[PDB]
Structure formats: C-alpha cells, structure tokens
C-alpha cells in the first residue's frame, strides 16, 4: 500500500490473455471468419511470448483449434466478447511485489452485456491460471482506457472516465486520487478531445494516444480536410503538445494517419486505427486494414523503436468495432 | 448521516414511477400487446396515486397513449427496458429530510444492457421530476432486491446480493454495513433458499418474500410435491421463520402458492408469483394470471388488510420475466 506502479506494455512479458471468439456471442455471425483471423493472430503473438487463451467451456471447435497450437495454453472460461484489453487484470508492482487488479468491466459503460466477462480474472485465479494475488477493485475501469509509461504517467482521457454509466458518484479529482492510490500514478495526463467513428467503448485512449516508450507518445491523425475526424484529431494533437514528462522536458510526439474509411455489409463506418498495436517483447505487432497506408506506418514506427514491426490483418476484428490490442492484456511474472 | 429509515411501500406515496415499453427494447416483438397491458396498469395504479411515466423521446405512439390521462404525467427519458423497481431511485429518511438514493443499477449483474436505465434517476432529477436531494451511491443494488419495514429492518436474500456481478469486493459482511449505513437498517434478515424459474434478477425477493405489513410477511409458496419448486420454497419458508421482529417475536408468515406452470411460445417457464404485488395507498393492487388460483389469492389476503384488494393481469408482464411490482417504484414527499 505504499509506491506501486503499473507496468509498461514495452516491458518484459510473460504471456498475453486473450480469449477466443465463439457462437455464444456477436461473432456468431461470421464466427467461421472469426476463427480464422483469430488463428492467425494467435501464431504471430505466439512467436514472440506465450498466449494464455481463454476458451468457451461450449466451445468444442475453438479448443480443438488451439488444442495444438505452440506457445499456446487453454483456459476453459467463459465470455461475452473477445476484448480481453477491457476486462483483462491490471498489473501493478506493489513495493515491488506483482499484484494483479481485477477492476470491474461492466461492458463500456452498461452498453453490453459483460456477465462473464467481468468474472474472467476470478475464474483465471481459482483455476490456478494466475500465479498472483488478485485484489478485486470497487472502481470500474477498462485496461484499453489508460495508458502507463511505467514510471509514474499515466494516458488517458475524459471522454471515458468521466462518461456517467463508469463511477458517477466521483468527480475527475475523485477519479484522477483513485489512479493515484491504485495504480500508483505521479502524473495523470488528461486531455478531452478526439474520437473514431463506429467506436463505441467512448474514446478508448489505446485507439487515440499510447505510449510507444518512456519518452514517445503515438496518436491517431488525420490531413484529409474532407474527413470527419479532422477537426477533433487536431484538437486532440493540440492538446498532446502540452504534455510533459516528469522531467518537465515534452514529449516526442508521432503521429499516425487512420486508412482511408472503411464500411460493413450495413454501411457502417469502423473505427480503424493503427494506434491499437501490441507491444510484444522483441516484435511491435501493428495492426494493418489492407489498405495503401499500411506500408507506410509500418516504415514510420520502424524509425522510432530497434524492435521488429509487423503488421497482421485486422480486418475482421474491426467488423466489431475493435482492433488488435483490444483483443489482448499482457501479463508478467516477477 | 445519521438516523435513517427506508420509507416502507405501505406508506403514504406520492406517485408510482414508471417507464412505458417502446420498440427500442425487448418489448418490439409484441409493442402493441406490451402497451395495451402497461395502459391498463397505469390507469388503474392512477385512481390510487399518481403516475409519473418515463416515455422514450423518440416514442411518438406511446407519448400519445398517455398525453391526456388523468392523474399521469409524462417525463421524456430513454431506457433500455420497464424495471424501474430496479433502476428507480430509493427513498430514506436522513434526519426528517427526505432523501432520494440513486443506487447504481448495472443490470442484474451484468446480463442485461442498462446504460439509459441507470441514468434514469440522474435525467428525472435535471429535468426537475425529482424535488427532493438525489445521492449517487457507489453500490450495485436493485429496489426489488430490499424490502422494508420502516422500522429499521430490511429483508433480503443471499441469491441476489452476493453475486458476484454486484458487490464482488464486499463480504456478506462487508454488504451488510452498508445497508446499516445507507439504509439505516437495525436489522437485516438474510435467507438463501427460494427460486423462479423464468426469472434472471438472481432471486429478488420482491416475488419471494415481503413485508405486507410491519408485523406480516408474505411470501411465494408450493404444495404440488412434484413441481420443481416445492423442496426450494420449503426450505425457504423454514427460514422465513426464524425471523424475528426488533421486539423478539416472531413474524407472522402468509404463504401465496404460485400460479399452475406458465410457458411462451418457446415454451419456456414464466416466473408469474402473486408476492410481486403494489402496496398503494388505500389499495393493494395484486397481479392475477388468468389462473384458477386468482380468486383465491385475492380473498386470502383480504383478509389480512383493511385495503382494497385488487387484481390486475400480468400474463404480458411476465412474458418478460417481470410482473407488477418490478415495473413501478413508489415516490415520496416530505
């Protein structure tokens, strides 16, 4: 209860939570196409840390699927979606002791339905999955809806934490002691504006500003004038610049242009975005939509980190309004 | 902070708050049946105590239902679903003053969609609907899970507030100060036994168990050995009898039997009971399900109140997993 902070994603990790899509959930509709993408996504993490992956105890398909898979271990438990970012525990070094928080997720702000999900840390831990303490958190919050630098920043926004269905009866301060207390924060950067479009986790900030290291922050821009995103992007830009690290010095800012639209079978805008990557280790997973500007942001992050970038097809996951790293929390082992 | 009491339902009430069923919910598949129903409902809680119905901003058809009923007046705010029993805000008494309480309501652990439900409270008190103090509280906890004497004891069930999607952090204990401390109870009378089948609310006891009165307690029984509920209701009205009044002695115990199996179209059993019922004002308004045992029921409890006795039908209602009672929430005036 006294100096703790929360580990950086650009740590060493020991293995990534996940959880595997099934019929008993949004994916049934295209759950063939899910397996798939998943799969391949699985293989790529698995080649650079272990790959905890929670599968439906219904889910006979899923689990013979992964059964075999190297680097891979099963954990029969079940879940509402895939988004195991959200409802993932937080890991925190408590006077140097690895705790794990279980936070609550009650689905974005009540919008979904988050009955198993929520229970996924607990059931990890009684099945011995989780070889540390697992303190249950009275504060809901999501693991995509902050960013930690491992020092003592902590990313996030307002659009999120002070949304109404997340904790009501406390006020920004009230929010920003409880990040203090529980994640051990010496510095809260806030900032209130951008957004994506078919998005509707509120603004996760791993979709619009991350820590890319101690001293970089990544976010999601946009030049075309035409766009809708334009004007809150450079808002969001404005408000970045303002940014210090503890040293008082600013951050080295890199910015990241969202693809060009993309649509579903209704017409539907989805939020894409390159932001949502996946530090792994010795690999920098970077989400990529088949789209001209692939290329190009998998080059621009190669200039600003000695780790390898790949780039793995994300076109399916945003079908459901989410990316790479929303599918994933890592987890360590001190 | 310090001296409280929740109001009992057989207290003098102000108006009933309500939420009418529109398209953007559960109830599109059968919308006109779901209105024609509540339109009954409400006209008749209305020749008792005011009605205050929350009507969907975009329910053009519904808004036109109740425009010019007497004795009812419309509030324009969007929710997910009619329970406002379980969303609705909880009365006490700090001190003399009368204070509303806006427990977080996520939906019944989670397995329901409640972003607009929750807010409901919030919206009423903006919109000027609620002319008394409204407190955000940092608890999960639905009307329909409590019952209150008003006298310091409040009766509830372990199946509900124990589970884990409400108050995980928090022990029997843990849950048990703070309904002393937020509700004012001197006494907490817990019980673990009693089920429904159909219902997904974890139990509440408002279709298990109640307070008539201060000295009585009603409560859902079964003698048909070989319906499935029998063994559970038995043990459950063995429990109900160890409890005690603040003056040492015993309650006085009034068993309802359950009405014969209900099923919908997908034959799936309705969780009709005859315990869901409204204390309001000078009339007890009980639902009925076109079942042999209405009349019976009826008369029974006649017999232990000097109020009108009155039936209304809840074979719509239940098509939900609902009846009476988690479809209306009494207000107060001091």
Same mark, same amino acid.
């Given at each position: ?10 740590? @060493?990790?020991?293995?990534? +939570?996940?959880? &595997? ?18 799969? #391949? ?22 689990? /013979? ?10 954990? *029969? ?17 408590? !006077? ?28 990890? @831990?009684?099945?011995? &999955? ?34 109404? #269905?997340?904790?009501?009866? +406390? ?8 990040? @203090?207390? %529980? ?13 994506? *479009?078919? =998005?509707?986790? =509120? ?7 991350? &820590?890319? =290291? ?10 075309? *004038?035409?766009? /809708? !995103? ?14 210090? *690290? ?5 951050? @080295? ?11 579903? %079978?209704?017409?539907?805008? +989805? ?5 949502? &990557?996946?530090?792994? #280790? =010795? ?15 998998? %080059?621009?992050?190669?200039? !600003? ?11 399916? +996951? ?14 360590? /082992?001190?």
């Amino acid at each position: 209860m006294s100096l703790k902070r929360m580990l950086a994603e650009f740590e @060493k990790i020991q293995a990534i +939570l996940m959880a &595997f899509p099934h019929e008993f959930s949004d994916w049934a509709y295209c759950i063939k196409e899910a397996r798939e993408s998943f799969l #391949n996504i699985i293989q790529t993490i698995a080649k650079h840390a272990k790959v905890l992956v929670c599968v439906h105890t219904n889910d006979t398909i899923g689990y /013979e699927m992964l059964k075999n898979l190297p680097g891979v271990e099963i954990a *029969k438990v079940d879940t509402n979606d895939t988004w195991a970012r959200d409802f993932g525990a937080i890991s925190i070094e408590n !006077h140097g002791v690895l705790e794990c928080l279980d936070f609550g997720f009650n689905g974005w702000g009540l919008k979904y339905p988050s009955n198993l999900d929520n229970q996924v840390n607990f059931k990890l @831990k009684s099945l011995g &999955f989780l070889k540390h303490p697992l303190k249950t958190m009275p504060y809901v919050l999501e693991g995509g809806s902050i960013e930690s630098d491992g020092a003592g920043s902590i990313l996030t926004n307002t659009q999120c934490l002070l949304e109404k #269905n997340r904790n009501p009866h +406390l006020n920004q301060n009230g929010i920003e002691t409880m990040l @203090k207390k %529980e994640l051990g924060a010496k510095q809260v950067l806030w900032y209130s504006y951008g957004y994506l *479009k078919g =998005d509707d986790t =509120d603004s996760h900030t791993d979709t619009l500003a991350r &820590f890319l =290291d101690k001293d970089t922050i990544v976010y999601s821009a946009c030049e075309d *004038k035409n766009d /809708e !995103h334009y004007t809150a992007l450079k808002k969001m830009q404005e408000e970045l610049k303002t940014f210090k *690290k503890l040293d008082k010095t600013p951050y @080295k800012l890199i910015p990241l242009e969202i693809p060009k639209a993309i649509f579903d %079978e209704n017409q539907q805008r +989805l939020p894409a975005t390159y932001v949502n &990557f996946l530090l792994c #280790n =010795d690999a920098l997973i970077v989400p990529t939509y088949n789209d001209p500007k692939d290329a190009l942001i998998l %080059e621009t992050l190669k200039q !600003h980190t000695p780790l390898e970038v790949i780039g793995v097809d994300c076109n399916t +996951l945003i079908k459901q309004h989410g990316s790479l790293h929303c599918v994933t929390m890592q987890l360590y /082992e001190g």
